[PDB]
Design a protein around this nucleic acid. Structure first.
Lengths: 64, 103, 37, 168, 96, 125
RNA sequence: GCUUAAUUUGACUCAACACGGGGAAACUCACCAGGUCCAGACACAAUAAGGAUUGACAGAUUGAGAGCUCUUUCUUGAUUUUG
């Protein structure tokens, strides 16, 4: 509920208007650069995600 | 037969009045049109650096200097007159340039 | 760069020569710098 | 082209300040102390000055175009136009710049340093000097930093004579 | 320090009419004209080659120098198995 | 195809000139079926092997080889044991003679520049 | 001084303390509890093809970043990994 919105806006709203409801730095840090190898957590976050009962553990990878 | 322009920007002031004299010498033995050697304001370089290799001691500094003098002459002559005389006024440390800018 | 004499800091970035200033006082002669005042 | 103006009068000095090193670090005999760069149109004529040009000439080009193949290739300079005109460098004690090289080597091949020292002096103070100056401050076979010394003269430095009497 | 031996033209070849190796204290860029390394190979390979002689090393503000001499006729003339009067180092060129 | 007994001692050099060059293939896992990709090109073999497993599959086309690249066919089992680059090691004094390799695929020039042209008068005598 | 997972230290009367040109994050790197791969001149040697390695993984592996694991087709090729 940033803008008085539904606080359950979890899968329905994408990453793009996620930036729209946000302050200025990530409103610049959005087209800041198309990361590939620093976009390597997200290729491995989905490698272990949501395959569990209530309350999980992700697959963390050593990063910077 | 074209108006030309010569520049010379050196750093040995004794070895720039011999060159600028023999430039106007052999031109006036052939009596071309000319304008005198215009002498520009000189340029000085400087860098302050303190005087210790380590840092332990009292503090005041140095100041180094380097002086650049530059003067230039405009000229007009037939090309056969000038293309020989610009090759016999060489001297180390001295730079010579020819500009034929006639826009 | 670290040039020579225990220095990668205090480099003289001006005038495009890039010398460690510990190793400038002994090279400032033959470059053609001299002190006068 | 696209050439910065005052930098070309300071970059060549950096080029001056490093070429001399090999005439230090490679040779010892002939006396080629003072280098001299003479840039004519489209050729850089640094004058080779050697009293015994057989290290350089030898078998018609021992090191004429052998030393150039480093330095011209070092600065990405063009070949052929790297002219190194041969000459003879000046006399041993009977020159000005050679008094560096005169005493750059004349401490002994292994006997006492005083008999090294008292040799170097009597030559040129009568035969073409009233001031030169070398450096010695060292020990003699102990754990002391003792400092014995000598020189030959008072110099000539009276103002701007610091800056034409000091040299390369 | 490995000596990878994939290419003698980029190991020791075309210096027979050069005789010199200019180099640089470097670190990882792997491209250099006129010499046999990319940017590391002959540098660590001359380390073996200096230790059999025939190349002399100055440093001189971090530019490695090398030049050949008499104890170099024993490999180049036979590894490239060529006759005389075309290889040599003391007569490196048409005049030197 | 035939051979000789005198000039072949000067021709124990095709396999012998492979010593350090990091492109060498002295094996069975690459030096027997070296005619497949095109990068796999030829095999220099000898028919006096003690193991006739894979060579007799390739012996059907070895004596009638391809007409684009050399397929050197010899008879004696010495160069595979001595003149392969490791049997007789060209050493003065300290020489630990290890045994020669298997069938070795070689394709190199150098000392084998002119000797690929001198093998014309070898397979007929 | 304290503190610390370490707060990297040099220098203590004028002649130490806005100074080591010390205005800041990853360059600096000297430090801390993770990660690396690079250790060979010659003279020693052995597996040097029936196998070291060059495998760099070759991508799912593999839990933890290209990975150091083989599940194998190897450029294999004694370079050198090695001792």
């Amino acid at each position: 509920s940033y803008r008085g919105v539904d606080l359950e806006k979890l899968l329905e709203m994408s990453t793009e208007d996620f930036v729209k409801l946000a302050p200025a730095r990530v409103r610049r840090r959005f087209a800041r650069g198309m990361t590939s190898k620093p976009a390597g957590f997200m290729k491995k976050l989905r490698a272990a995600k949501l395959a569990a009962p209530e309350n999980e553990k992700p697959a963390p990878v050593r990063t910077h | 037969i074209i108006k030309i322009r010569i520049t010379l920007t050196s750093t040995k002031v004794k070895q720039l009045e011999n060159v600028s004299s023999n430039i106007v010498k052999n031109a006036e033995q052939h009596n071309l049109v000319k304008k005198g050697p215009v002498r520009l304001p000189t340029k000085v370089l400087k860098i302050s650096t303190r005087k210790t290799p380590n840092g332990e001691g009292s503090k005041t500094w140095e100041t180094y200097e380097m002086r650049i003098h530059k003067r230039y002459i405009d000229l007009e002559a037939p090309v056969q007159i000038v293309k020989r005389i610009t090759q016999i006024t060489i001297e180390p440390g001295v730079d010579v340039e020819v500009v034929v800018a006639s826009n | 760069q670290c040039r020579v004499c225990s220095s990668h800091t205090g480099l003289i970035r001006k005038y495009g020569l890039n010398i460690c200033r510990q190793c400038f006082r002994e090279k400032a002669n033959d470059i053609g710098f001299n002190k006068f005042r | 082209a696209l050439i910065s103006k005052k930098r070309k009068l300071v970059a060549d000095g950096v080029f001056y300040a490093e070429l001399n090193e090999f005439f230090t670090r490679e040779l010892a005999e002939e006396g080629y102390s003072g280098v001299e760069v003479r840039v004519t149109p489209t050729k850089t004529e640094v004058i080779i000055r050697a009293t015994r040009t057989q290290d350089v000439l030898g078998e018609n080009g021992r090191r004429i175009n052998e030393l150039t193949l480093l330095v011209q290739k070092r600065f990405k300079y063009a070949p052929g136009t790297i002219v190194l005109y041969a000459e003879r460098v000046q006399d041993r004690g009977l020159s000005a710049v050679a008094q560096a090289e005169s005493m750059k080597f004349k401490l002994l091949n292994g006997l006492a340093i005083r008999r090294a020292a008292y040799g170097v002096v009597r030559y040129v103070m009568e035969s073409g000097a009233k001031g030169c100056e070398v450096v010695v401050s060292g020990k003699l076979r102990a754990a002391r930093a003792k400092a014995m010394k000598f020189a030959d003269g008072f110099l000539i430095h009276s103002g701007q004579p610091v800056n034409d009497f000091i040299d390369t | 320090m490995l000596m990878p031996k994939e290419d003698r033209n980029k190991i020791h070849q075309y210096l027979f009419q050069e005789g010199v190796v200019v180099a640089k204290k470097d670190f990882n860029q792997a491209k250099h004209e006129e010499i046999d390394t990319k940017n590391l190979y002959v540098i660590k390979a001359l380390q073996s080659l200096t230790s059999k002689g025939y190349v002399k090393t100055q440093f001189s503000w971090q530019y490695y120098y090398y030049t050949l001499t008499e104890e170099g006729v024993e490999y180049l003339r036979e590894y490239l198995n060529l006759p005389e009067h075309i290889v040599p180092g003391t007569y490196i060129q048409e005049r030197n | 195809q035939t051979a000789e007994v005198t000039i072949e001692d000067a021709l124990k050099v095709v396999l012998r000139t492979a010593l350090v060059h990091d492109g060498l293939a002295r094996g069975l896992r690459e030096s027997t079926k070296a005619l497949t990709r095109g990068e796999a090109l030829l095999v220099v073999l000898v028919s006096s092997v003690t193991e006739a497993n894979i060579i007799k599959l390739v012996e059907g086309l070895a004596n009638d080889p391809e007409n684009k690249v050399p397929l050197i066919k010899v008879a004696d089992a010495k160069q595979l044991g001595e003149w392969a680059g490791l049997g007789k090691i060209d050493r003065e004094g300290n020489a630990r003679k290890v045994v020669g390799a298997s069938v070795v695929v070689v394709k190199n020039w150098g000392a084998e520049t002119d000797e690929l042209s001198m093998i014309m008068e070898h397979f007929s005598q």
